[PDB]
Amino acid sequence: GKLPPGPTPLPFIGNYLQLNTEQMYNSLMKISERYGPVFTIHLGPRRVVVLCGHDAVKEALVDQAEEFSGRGEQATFDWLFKGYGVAFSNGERAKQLRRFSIATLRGFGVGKRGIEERIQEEAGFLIDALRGTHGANIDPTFFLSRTVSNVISSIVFGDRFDYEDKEFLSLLRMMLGSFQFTATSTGQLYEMFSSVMKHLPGPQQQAFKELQGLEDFIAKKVEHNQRTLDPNSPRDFIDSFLIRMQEEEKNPNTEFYLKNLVMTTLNLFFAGTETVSTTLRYGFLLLMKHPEVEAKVHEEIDRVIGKNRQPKFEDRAKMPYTEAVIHEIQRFGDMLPMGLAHRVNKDTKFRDFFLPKGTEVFPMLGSVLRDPRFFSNPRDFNPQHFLDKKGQFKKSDAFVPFSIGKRYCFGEGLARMELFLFFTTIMQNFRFKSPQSPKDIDVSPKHVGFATIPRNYTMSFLPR
Ligand code: HEM
Ligand SMILES: CN(CCCC(=O)c1cccnc1)N=O
Ligand SMILES: CN(CCCC(=O)c1cccnc1)N=O
C-alpha cells in the first residue's frame, strides 16, 4: 500500500483549501508542478489519483489499458445512472453494452456512407434555417444543437425531430443546462460535497430536474417502441436493444434489460448532442476572432469542393488546412478537460506507486491537449499545430479529446465526420460576422470544469 505523493487533506473537506472551485484546472496544474506528474488528491472525502501530461496519461490509459479501464464516481450523474448504461458501467456490464452499442451504431450507418448521407440530409435543414434568418444577429446555440441532435436522434429514435417541436427545444435546454452545470464552480463543489449539496437549494437542483426530464423522455419513447415493436424489422437503436432483450430473456444474468437500455440510450442521445454542438459553437467564435483562418478555410472549400457540391467525408484528404483548423478547435476547446473519471479494476503497480483495487483516477486530458512538448504554442489558437512544413496534415500523439485506451469515446468516428461535414457545409454557404471587431472577441471560456463552455455571443450568417 504506497500512493502517489500529494497535499495533506483535512477531514471531510479533503484538499478543499488548495482547490479553487472556479478554476480547478489551474489548481490541479499547481499541485502537479509541486508534487509530480502523478499525484493524489482528496476531492472532499474522496481519494483520487490524478494524471498530468501526455506521458502520465498515456502510460496509464494505454500501456496499462486493462488496469485503468474502470469507470470512477461522477456525482452530478451517479444519483441517476447508478452504475447502469454504457458510459457509467464497469466490468462485464461495460464490455457487453459497449460491444453492442458499437455493433448497433455501425448497423445504422456509423462510419460508412449511410451516416454521411444522414449528416448531409440534416445539414440541409440547418442551411435553410440559417438563410431564413437574413443575416440578423442570432445566438447560434440552438440552431446548431437542433441539427447535431437530429443525427443521433434519427439513429436512436428512428426519426428526426421537427425544428419547431417545442418538446425538442425543451430537451435541448435540459442537455445544455446539465452539461454546463459540470463546468461551473457550483458543479465542482457538488462533486466534492454531493452528500450535503443534493439536499440544498441551488443550481444543482435545476440540473437534476433536467437530467430527470431527459430520462422520463427516453423511458416514454422506449414504452412506445415496445408497444409497436416488429422483432424482424428494427427501426432504431431502441428496437435493436429490445430485440436483443427478447433473445436474452432466458439468461437471468444478462446485461440486456430495460434499465441498461434506458441509460445507454440516454448516454447516446446526450453524448451525441452536446459535445459536437459545443465544439461547433466554440469554433465559430474562434473563427470570427481569426478571419484570416476563416479566409483560408474558404479558399480550400472553394477549390476542392465548390460553392454548391455538398462536402463528403473523402474531401478531407485533399483539405489539410480545414482539417488542421478543426483539430485545432478540438485541442483549443478542451471540451472534456478531465474526460470521464476512471478507476483501477485490480491492485495495480504504476511506476513506483501501488494503487489498490477501486482507486479513482482522473486523466487530465486538458493537460495533454496543452502539453508544451507536443505543441509549439500550447496556449494560442494555431492551426499550424496540425501542419508539417509542406502544408500537409500532421497527427499528434497528444491529440486526445476523445481520450485513449479501452474506454475511449466510441463516438469518435461519428464526431469527426459530423465536425468535418458541418464545418465545411456551413462555411461553404456563409461567412461569419460578429457585431464586434475581431480584437474585442473574448475566446476565453465562460466556465471551465468537467466541460469547457464558450462565452455567450451572437453572430450574423452572411451568404456567399
Ligand atoms: C466532440 C465530440 C466528443 C468528444 C470531445 C468526446 C469525448 C469523450 C471522452 C473524453 C470520453 C471518456 C472516455 C473515457 O472514459 O476515457 C467519452 C466517452 C464516451 N462517449 Fe464521447 N465524445 C464526443 C462525441 C461522442 C458522440 C457523438 C457519442 C455518441 C455516439 C459519444 C459517446 C460516448 C460514449 C457512449 C462514451 C462512454 C464509453 C465508455 O464508457 O466505454 N461521444 N467521450
Ligand atoms: C448525462 N450524460 C453523462 C455522460 C455523457 C458522456 O459520457 C459523454 C459526453 C460527451 C461525449 N462523450 C461522452 N450521459 O448521459
Ligand atoms: C460534462 N461531462 C461530464 C464530466 C464527467 C464528470 O462529471 C467527472 C467527475 C469527476 C471526475 N472527472 C469527471 N460529460 O458530459
From Swiss-Prot:
It is found in: Endoplasmic reticulum membrane; Microsome membrane. GO terms for cellular component: cytoplasm; endoplasmic reticulum membrane; intracellular membrane-bounded organelle. GO terms for biological process: aflatoxin metabolic process; coumarin metabolic process; epoxygenase P450 pathway; xenobiotic metabolic process. The keyword NADP does not apply. Pfam families: p450. PROSITE patterns: CYTOCHROME_P450. Its EC number is 1.14.14.1. Heme binds at residue 409. It catalyses: an organic molecule + reduced [NADPH--hemoprotein reductase] + O2 = an alcohol + oxidized [NADPH--hemoprotein reductase] + H2O + H(+). Keywords: Endoplasmic reticulum, Heme, Iron, Membrane, Metal-binding, Microsome, Monooxygenase, Oxidoreductase. Its cofactor is heme. Changing residue 293 to L: In allele CYP2A13*9. Changing residue 423 to Y: In allele CYP2A13*5. It is an enzyme of class 1 (oxidoreductase). Its main location: endoplasmic reticulum. It is a peripheral membrane protein. It comes from the Eukaryota. One of its GO terms (molecular function) is monooxygenase activity. Changing residue 464 to C: In allele CYP2A13*6. Belongs to the cytochrome P450 family. This is Cytochrome P450 2A13. It comes from Homo sapiens. The lineage of its organism: Eukaryota, Metazoa, Chordata, Craniata, Vertebrata. The gene is CYP2A13.
